[PDB]
Paper text:
Saracatinib is a potent inhibitor of the protein kinase [name]. Saracatinib binds inactive [name] in an αC-in conformation. Within the ATP-binding pocket, the bound ligand was well resolved by the electron density map. Although the quinazoline of saracatinib formed a hydrogen bond to the hinge residue His286, specificity was likely derived from the large chlorobenzodioxole moiety, which nicely complemented the size, shape, and hydrophobicity of the back pocket. The tetrahydropyran ring was located in the ribose pocket below the glycine-rich loop (β1-β2), whereas the methylpiperazine moiety was extended largely into solvent. By contrast, the [name] complex exhibited an inactive conformation in which the αC helix was swung inwards to compress the ATP pocket. As a result, the equivalent αC (Glu248) and glycine-rich loop (Tyr219) residues were packed inside the ATP pocket where they mediated additional interaction with the chlorobenzodioxole and tetrahydropyran groups, respectively. Structural differences between the [name] and SRC complexes with saracatinib were evident from the different conformations of their catalytic domains. The previously determined SRC complex structure displayed an inactive αC-out conformation that widened the ATP pocket and rotated the αC residue Glu310 away to solvent, as well as the glycine-rich loop residue Phe278. Thus, further optimization of this chemotype could yield molecules with increased selectivity for [name] over SRC family kinases.
Numbering used by the authors: 205 to 368, 372 to 499
Amino acid sequence: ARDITLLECVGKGRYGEVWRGSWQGENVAVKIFSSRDEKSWFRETELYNTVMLRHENILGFIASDMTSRHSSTQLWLITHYHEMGSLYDYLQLTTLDTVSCLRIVLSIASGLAHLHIEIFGTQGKPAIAHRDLKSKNILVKKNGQCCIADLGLAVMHSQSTNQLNNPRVGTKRYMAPEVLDETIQVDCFDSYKRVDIWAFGLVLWEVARRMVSNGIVEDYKPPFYDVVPNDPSFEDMRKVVCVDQQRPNIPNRWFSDPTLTSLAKLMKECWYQNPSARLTALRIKKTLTKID
Ligand SMILES: CN1CCN(CCOc2cc(OC3CCOCC3)c3c(Nc4c(Cl)ccc5c4OCO5)ncnc3c2)CC1
Ligand SMILES: [K+]
């Protein structure tokens, strides 16, 4: 709205940049989109202002603005601020106990389940697949819960219509096997929900590594840290996941802990090569609730 005062830059990449801003006394996060990502800015804006997307575990919308002149375009998305930053940065220095670990993973599954499920009525919403789920697109709150942030690559589906993208978009390190070997049924909306579930299982692994049991804990590592380089190519990922049939390694110490044991069983059922065999977000949520 440019009544915002852009204080400090808290993120910078291909997507654009994210600024901590001040708007009427309160802190806000301002994502400044490139002109090359105009379609992503509008899709994310339209979910927020037309679908009325809102949930305790989804990044809170505040405002969206576009100003465009002949030879100038500025694309702003304004949301609630979260001073703890991404789950990725949060896991770097923090360790977790059983309670705070389950609060992180259950809140993520709660937000993902809310995205996936279609709601009917005048105040309803379509089914939504995220398609770029990863630890850098998840923010941590002060209460220890998380929200899902980046909705630019989302796809929607309403049973009341025949409405239905991008071929190979998303972080390659988090791509599902059916995306890498190109067998994904791009015309079934359920394929994108299952691609989100594969990514969710990778994040489960990232978080559980940082949970202490028996005085032990693992350093933060990204998924497949030990078998691919940084910025891995599409081919590197296809060799590791599709050909070598490799999955993130479960430390043996997890099995001495019954909580890390259940999360381990949850990860495996998100990593099936057969996408139809993978759990749904709703089933993951119910399972995580029983653990408490
Ligand atoms: C240097 N540190 C000092 C303090 N602390 C600040 C908290 O950092 C953020 C960063 C955000 O975005 C980054 C998240 C990781 O990937 C790069 C950007 C925040 C954020 N981002 C955001 C996303 Cl991911 C998606 C849509 C958005 C957004 O803001 C406007 O609309 N939103 C809220 N708070 C953030 C705090 C750590 C850094
Ligand atoms: K809040």
